[PDB]
Design an enzyme around this catalytic site. Structure first.
Site, short mmCIF file in Angstrom:
data_model
loop_
_atom_site.label_atom_id
_atom_site.label_comp_id
_atom_site.label_asym_id
_atom_site.label_seq_id
_atom_site.Cartn_x
_atom_site.Cartn_y
_atom_site.Cartn_z
N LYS A 60 30.76 45.27 44.36
CA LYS A 60 29.38 44.82 44.60
C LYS A 60 28.55 45.77 45.45
O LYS A 60 27.36 45.95 45.20
CB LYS A 60 29.37 43.43 45.24
N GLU B 276 21.18 36.10 45.41
CA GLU B 276 22.04 34.97 45.06
C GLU B 276 23.48 35.35 45.38
O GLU B 276 23.82 36.53 45.39
CB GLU B 276 21.94 34.69 43.55
N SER C 74 38.54 45.12 40.56
CA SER C 74 37.18 44.99 41.09
C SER C 74 37.08 44.62 42.57
O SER C 74 36.08 44.94 43.21
CB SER C 74 36.39 43.97 40.26
C1 LIG Z 1 35.52 40.85 43.27
C2 LIG Z 1 34.71 40.41 42.21
N1 LIG Z 1 35.12 40.69 40.96
C3 LIG Z 1 34.35 40.28 39.87
C4 LIG Z 1 33.15 39.58 40.03
C5 LIG Z 1 32.46 39.20 38.86
O1 LIG Z 1 31.18 39.83 38.78
P1 LIG Z 1 30.90 40.95 37.67
O2 LIG Z 1 31.57 42.19 38.13
O3 LIG Z 1 29.33 41.13 37.79
O4 LIG Z 1 31.25 40.41 36.34
C6 LIG Z 1 32.71 39.26 41.33
C7 LIG Z 1 31.48 38.59 41.51
N2 LIG Z 1 31.05 38.10 42.69
C8 LIG Z 1 29.67 37.55 42.87
C9 LIG Z 1 29.45 37.12 44.34
O5 LIG Z 1 30.06 37.77 45.22
O6 LIG Z 1 28.65 36.19 44.56
C10 LIG Z 1 29.32 36.39 41.92
O7 LIG Z 1 29.73 35.15 42.51
C11 LIG Z 1 27.79 36.33 41.64
C12 LIG Z 1 27.30 37.63 40.97
C13 LIG Z 1 27.48 35.13 40.74
C14 LIG Z 1 33.51 39.71 42.40
O8 LIG Z 1 33.12 39.45 43.68
#
Ligand SMILES: Cc1ncc(COP(=O)(O)O)c(/C=N/[C@H](C(=O)O)[C@@H](O)C(C)C)c1O
Ligand SMILES: Cc1ncc(COP(=O)(O)O)c(/C=N/[C@H](C(=O)O)[C@@H](O)C(C)C)c1O
Ligand code: NA
Ligand code: NA
Lengths: 385, 385
Positions: free
Chosen positions: A82, A104, A371
């Protein structure tokens, strides 16, 4: 604007001007040598890029098939990919004359990422988060507060990631003169899916250079989990024109696709318009948006980025699902076999890669996008075990 | 074995054999090509080295004095510098035919690092941890368990790091044929103070190269927190022969030196023998060890490594103290100003660097070893507000 038919910009007329200013600013700075020098400098000295590409030898041996490599986004400052997008967008916002970031969040990692970038760049940060979601994740909330950000609890609708986005849009509609809406995945109206994918593309650019150095060849498959889809697009994008490389996105199968309790927008959702974009969303019998579920908080969003809907349609990428239980097994497996505690989101990709590797040759190569790290998920895994 | 008058090998005769064998094996593999290739390969692809050297520009300009650079050990896999030593020693143990690792831990980061290294290499791992420490760093306790390690709570004596080490030594005395005691700081009998310092020296060699890139000169001051002293020795050691570089070790001042609730072994301690070494220890009138205190759990060890005792004796390094209050202020200040949440241990170094920078010129340079990230300390910081 569009990826085939998907994406676009379906917003109230009040947002058309602000979105156009963002498009123009992005077009101005995206290839600007100083903007990129500064971004690369923060990515290097602050975020710690490049992240390594790790050969998971024990796991590879244990499965007895393809070589499994892990792109280690778990090592990025903040513990997730992120950050790559937060530190891309925040300086752009600052160059546009914005003094305030809103965002968000659900898993709280994007909230933290945004809070970190805002602290670094001296910008005010307000994070919208569902009132149910803020009680669900006290750690990241306290992290956000420690970083100087304000966490606004959302008490409207279903009070989750979908409704956090709803409140953020209303705020941005009133405050866009001085506020940048820092969207955290490859979703929303143009130009956000493109911007977020571009800032995440560093993952794939590093991974490609790293696998060419390590093995002298491109991978046979790339596997990444897909919530909104940013980490997946980040690693996929630089390989899109390498016809040899299979791309597999792994969605949250939750308690099973038959249960309804999942977040598999591409596998079980329906095309529709929400949050300014045309893409796949989970929908009820009537046709309205339906709540999602996953053991992984970050995959718990009912929609998916339009570029994945496009890649699905042209069959450039294949999308699959992994259940809560399979992800949980992979979480334990990686921890015990490689000494890496993965995020529950990432565990979905690891779980699928383990199945896939089994039926592939020992000479073949899989890169899994790790990720994030699993420190945030410890209470969840404790209760689940 | 000796650092001037400090160090030695004060153990029961039953451990003299295994220590000689460890010294022999280290002597053999220390400069060996394959051992070092493997180690560097693990440090790069698994641990994520090199870590960046970050210019804390906002913090610097806010204080208005010397430039503050942060060596980002917080980004190492595991969240602290401890991994550098764990992944150095664990493969050495394997080469010596050992199948089990034991280790002490207080803050839990070394336990995690040992569990991670053991998981990676497929070795059994038992971690001795004081009952008091189990209850206040329970996030790391679960990380250890998820990594496949067994955490053995130690109830003897004051139920702290010193007591954990006591149990580990007794275990090792019975199990040395197949067990390696993976000590986590520059403490214990020879050759451990030398070995740990050697595996942590990568920090200072990188920092040296990185500060020459960033500024074209060596720093004026290097500042690092000192518990047992491993992160400090790691960053100090490569600069020891650069006479113009001041080296400042920061011990835990606790509630204040005069309150008697601290861990300032070098500043307030007396010479003594414990855990196989002659060095400085917090000791009462009747030759017994005073119970240490710090808000930072990782500085809660009543002693200090003999190489620091030596460096103080010859006045090559200066040793100072920072109180709980001052460290806590630094924790918040770094988080808000640079978007980096530091370990409370590292916050002692940051705190002192901030005081020191104010007194220094804007052209001068301070490097602070940021030994860990602060995710583990979120509960402790909540209470101390
Ligand atoms: C470690 C980790 N791996 C995968 C994801 C999934 O988000 P994508 O990479 O955008 O598909 C996330 C997504 N996290 C967001 C958050 O931190 O709020 C998610 O909840 C929001 C974009 C809706 C993540 O933190
Ligand atoms: C983040 C962090 N920063 C500094 C220290 C102090 O250890 P040194 O580097 O050996 O002086 C520590 C020490 N941690 C040990 C542990 O994790 O078990 C400590 O509690 C024990 C070796 C006594 C730490 O975790
Ligand atoms: Na989804
Ligand atoms: Na001490």
């Amino acid at each position: 604007m569009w990826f085939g038919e998907f994406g676009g910009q379906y917003v109230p007329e009040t947002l058309v001007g602000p979105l156009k200013e963002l498009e123009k600013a992005y077009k101005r700075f995206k290839d600007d040598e100083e903007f990129n020098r500064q971004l690369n400098y923060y990515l290097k000295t602050w975020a710690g890029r490049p992240t390594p590409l790790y050969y998971a030898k024990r796991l590879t041996e244990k499965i007895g098939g393809a070589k499994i490599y892990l792109k280690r986004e778990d090592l990025v400052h903040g513990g997730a990919h992120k950050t790559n997008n937060a530190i891309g967008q925040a300086p752009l916002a600052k160059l546009m004359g914005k003094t305030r970031l809103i965002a968000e969040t659900g898993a709280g990692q994007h909230g933290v990422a945004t809070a970190m970038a805002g602290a670094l760049l001296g910008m005010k940060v307000d994070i919208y988060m569902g009132a149910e979601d803020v009680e669900r994740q006290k750690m990241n909330v306290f992290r956000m507060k420690l970083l100087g950000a304000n966490v606004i609890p959302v008490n409207s609708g279903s009070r989750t990631a979908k409704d956090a986005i709803n409140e953020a849009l209303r705020d941005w509609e009133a405050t866009f003169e001085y506020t940048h809406y820092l969207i955290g995945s490859v979703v929303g109206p143009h130009p956000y899916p493109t911007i977020v994918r571009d800032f995440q593309s560093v993952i794939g650019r590093e991974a490609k250079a790293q696998i060419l150095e390590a093995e002298g060849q491109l991978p046979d498959v790339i596997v990444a989990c897909v919530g909104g889809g940013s980490n997946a697009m980040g690693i996929f994008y630089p390989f899109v024109n390498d016809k040899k490389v299979k791309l597999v996105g792994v969605e949250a199968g939750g308690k099973g696709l038959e249960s309804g309790k999942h977040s598999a927008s591409l596998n079980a959702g329906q095309v529709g318009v929400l949050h300014g974009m045309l893409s796949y969303f989970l929908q009820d019998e009537e046709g309205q948006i339906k709540p999602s579920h996953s053991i992984a908080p970050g995959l718990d969003y009912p929609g998916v980025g339009p570029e994945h809907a496009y890649l699905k349609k042209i069959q450039r990428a294949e999308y699959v699902t992994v259940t809560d239980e399979e992800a949980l097994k992979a979480f334990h497996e990686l921890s015990r076999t490689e000494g890496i505690i993965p995020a529950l989101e990432s565990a979905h990709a690891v779980a699928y890669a383990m199945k896939l590797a089994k039926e592939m040759s020992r000479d073949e190569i899989i890169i899994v996008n790790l990720s994030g790290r699993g420190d945030k998920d410890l209470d969840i895994v404790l209760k689940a075990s």
